[PDB]
Amino acid sequence: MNTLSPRLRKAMNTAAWAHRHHVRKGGGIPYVSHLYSVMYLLASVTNDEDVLIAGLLHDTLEDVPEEYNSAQLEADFGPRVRELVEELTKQPLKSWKARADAYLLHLSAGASLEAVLISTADKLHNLMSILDDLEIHGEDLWQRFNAGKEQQIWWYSEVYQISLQRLGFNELNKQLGLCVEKLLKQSALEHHH
Amino acid sequence: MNTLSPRLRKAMNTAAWAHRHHVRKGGGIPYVSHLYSVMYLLASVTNDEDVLIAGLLHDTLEDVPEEYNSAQLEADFGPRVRELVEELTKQPLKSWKARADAYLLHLSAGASLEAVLISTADKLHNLMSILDDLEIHGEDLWQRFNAGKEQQIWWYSEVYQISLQRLGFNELNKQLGLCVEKLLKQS
Ligand SMILES: [Mg+2]
Ligand SMILES: [Mg+2]
C-alpha cells in the first residue's frame, strides 16, 4: 500500500478543496467521498503514486475547472498526472450516447493501461453507489440521472468488458463484474413485480 | 486491505457530509481530508472495519455534534463504533495542558488498543500536516496554534511513547516516530 507522502497529502487536500461545494447528483453528499473512494480502490491495485493522484483529481477539470484548471494541475503534480487526467476527458458532443460511444472506443484502443485502471475504479465506485441508492430509492432513482436503466446497464457492462480485455482479472475488474451482475438482478427484480 | 463494503461506503459519505462546513484550522481546506487520511493510514495496519469507521467518524461528536450525534452514530454503525469514538473524547477543561494530560493518562491506561491505534493515526496525520506547513510558512507557523513549539514537541513525543508502550511497533508508530524526529531536527 502506498505511503501517505507529502505529494499524496497535497492531492487529498487539493481534491477536497476544489470540490468543497461540489455535491454528488441526487443528494447532499460532498463529491470528495467519490474521489477518495476511487483513490482507495486504486491503492489496492497500484503502487504508482501518479495513478492515485490522477484518481483523486480525475474530475477536477470536467466538474470544477473554475476552482482547479490543467495548468494548476501540471504545476502542482507534473505533466504525467495531467496527461492521465486529460485522457479521461469527453468528446464535446450533444448526445449522451455519442459521448459514451467515443469514450468506450478510446478505452479499448488509445487510452493507456493507467487511464483504463482509473476509469475502472471510477465506474466501479459509481456502480457501487447506484446499487446502494437502489436499495434505498428503488426503481424511482433513475430520474436524477442523465441516462436511464437500460442505458446504464449497457454502459457498465461495456466498461466492464473493455476493462477486462485490457487489464485482465484484477481486484477492480472482479468487483466491477460482480456489480454488473447485481445490476442485472435488480432489473430482473423490477420486471418480476 | 479492507474491501469497500456498503457499510464502509456509508461511513465515507457520512464523514464527508457531517463535516461539509468544517474546515482545517488556518485555511479553507475541508476537514474531511484529515478524516480520509486517518482512515487510509488505519487501512494499512488493520482489517477491523469498525476501526476504519471510527477513524472516519472520530471527530463528528466533538467538532460537528449538531450535524451528527451519538444516537445517529450508534443507529447507523452500532455500539462498538460508538464506544470507539467515545473513548477518544477529550474532557471539557479550560486549560490546554489539563486537556492534554488527561487524554495522555487515558491513552496509557483505560483506552482500548483500537482507540490507541485510531489516536496514533490521527496524531500522525496532524504532525504530517504541521511538518508540511513548516516547509511552506516557516517558523512563523508556531504562532498559529493554541500550543507553542515546545508544547507541540512534548505532545507528539508523549503520544508516540504511549503508543509504543501499548501497541509495540507498527507502521503508524514507526511513521509517527519519524515525524517526531523531523520536528526535533527543526528546533
Ligand atoms: Mg468520477
Ligand atoms: Mg483528528
Side-chain angles (χ1 to χ4, degrees), chain B residues 75-95:
Chain B
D76 289 342
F77 300 102
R80 176 159 188 257
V81 166
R82 193 225 78 232
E83 262 162 358
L84 281 174
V85 172
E86 286 185 344
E87 299 182 60
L88 301 141
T89 52
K90 254 185 173 185
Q91 311 295 101
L93 301 156
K94 306 182 252 186
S95 165

Side-chain angles (χ1 to χ4, degrees), chain A residues 44-184:
Chain A
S44 69
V45 106
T46 190
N47 282 307
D48 189 344
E49 179 178 86
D50 289 351
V51 171
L52 300 187
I53 294 173
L56 277 168
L57 308 166
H58 73 273
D59 280 318
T60 61
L61 313 182
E62 298 297 272
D63 292 335
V64 291
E66 75 277 2
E67 308 298 333
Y68 203 65
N69 65 45
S70 52
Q72 294 181 267
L73 178 66
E74 175 163 354
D76 289 342
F77 299 102
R80 175 160 188 257
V81 166
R82 180 180 155 164
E83 260 163 57
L84 281 174
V85 172
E86 286 187 341
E87 278 190 88
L88 298 189
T89 54
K90 274 148 54 73
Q91 286 291 121
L93 301 154
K94 257 174 50 57
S95 166
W96 177 88
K97 222 220 136 160
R99 287 192 249 109
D101 274 353
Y103 185 89
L104 297 175
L105 198 248
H106 179 67
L107 248 217
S108 63
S112 70
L113 295 172
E114 291 84 6
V116 175
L117 195 63
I118 296 152
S119 181
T120 299
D122 173 50
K123 269 84 226 170
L124 166 57
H125 187 254
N126 287 341
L127 191 53
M128 285 171 161
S129 305
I130 284 162
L131 297 174
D132 285 359
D133 283 335
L134 275 180
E135 309 246 55
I136 300 167
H137 305 92
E139 59 266 18
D140 316 297
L141 180 75
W142 309 112
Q143 300 181 279
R144 59 199 56 182
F145 306 118
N146 316 73
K149 174 171 61 64
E150 238 60 37
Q151 281 194 142
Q152 299 278 89
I153 296 171
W154 167 80
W155 170 252
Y156 288 111
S157 45
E158 283 303 302
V159 160
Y160 169 64
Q161 161 80 98
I162 289 168
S163 177
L164 187 58
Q165 183 274 317
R166 295 287 313 263
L167 303 173
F169 279 112
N170 60 37
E171 287 306 315
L172 303 189
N173 273 333
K174 298 178 181 183
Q175 288 173 92
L176 181 56
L178 175 61
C179 285
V180 163
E181 282 300 302
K182 287 200 178 184
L183 190 63
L184 286 168

Side-chain angles (χ1 to χ4, degrees), chain B residues 8-28:
Chain B
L8 190 53
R9 292 197 289 276
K10 205 228 191 299
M12 232 118 138
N13 293 350
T14 306
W17 180 84
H19 295 271
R20 69 201 182 281
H21 296 144
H22 189 185
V23 129
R24 305 270 267 118
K25 282 186 214 122

Side-chain angles (χ1 to χ4, degrees), chain A residues 1-2 9 36 40 132, chain B residues 1-2 9 12 36 40 132:
Chain A
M1 187 158 238
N2 268 65
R9 291 198 290 276
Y36 175 62
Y40 185 82
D132 285 359
Chain B
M1 186 162 165
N2 269 64
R9 292 197 289 276
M12 232 118 138
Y36 287 170
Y40 185 82
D132 283 0

